[PDB]
């Protein structure tokens, strides 16, 4: 499913991301826009053989099992295909573990390069929340 900007903001708020570990809702919507263009079915293969999955591009090296990333972990305890669903529950639950791991939202390269330090409130302007 490809979300609209306010539709995804509302779904993230409902699942408890707004100010989760000090990151306001606009940070999460900005990261989803640049990682996947709001498409739950996005995949991308990395040079090391791992793959990134879903609206927040979560990586199979550490976080989920895809049966093809030898010697990797599965810290979220889920098959990576669960991250491609139109229901964002599995993606959101796994992102809360990643953001808690010590490096905050710097775990997402597009957030560090395109959202960090910008006016992120803009991503939720006009939405009914």
Where does this chain bind Na ion (CB under 5 A)? 60, 65, 69, 72, 74
Could you give the CA distance from residue 96 to residue 94 in angstroms, rounded to a whole number? Answer: 5
Query: Can 66 be counted among the known catalytic residues?
Result: no
Query: Can 52 be counted among the known catalytic residues?
Result: yes
101 has binding-site annotation: yes
CB of 58 to Cl ion, least distance (A): 14
**CA-CA-CA-CA dihedral for 13, 95, 114, 107, to nearest 10:** 150
CB of 73 to Na ion, least distance (A): 6
Which of 93-109 are b and which e, b meaning 16 or more Cβ less than 10 Å from the residue's Cβ?
Answer: ebbeebbeeeebbebbe
Which CB atom, from 27 or from 57, has the smaller least distance to Cl ion? 27
Give me 117's structure tokens. 């330090």
**89 Cβ neighbours under 8 A, 6+ residues apart:** 15
Q: x/- string (CB under 5 A) for Cl ion, residues 26-65?
A: x--------------------------------------x
Binding residues for substrate: 101
**Residues at the interface with Cl ion (CB under 5 A):** 5, 11, 24-26, 65, 69, 73-74, 79, 87-88, 104, 121
């Amino acid at each position: 499913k490809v979300f609209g900007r306010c539709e995804l903001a509302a779904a993230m708020k409902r699942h408890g991301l707004d100010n989760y570990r000090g990151y306001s809702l606009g940070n999460w919507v900005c990261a989803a826009k640049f990682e996947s263009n709001f498409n739950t079915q996005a995949t991308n293969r990395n040079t090391d053989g791992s793959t990134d999955y879903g609206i927040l591009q979560i990586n199979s090296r550490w976080w989920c099992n895809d049966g093809r990333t030898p010697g990797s972990r599965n810290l979220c305890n889920i098959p990576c295909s669960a991250l491609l669903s139109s229901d964002i529950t599995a993606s959101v639950n796994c992102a809360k573990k990643i953001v808690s791991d010590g490096n905050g939202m710097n775990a997402w390269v597009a957030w560090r390069n395109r959202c960090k330090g910008t006016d992120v409130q803009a991503w939720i302007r006009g939405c009914r929340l």
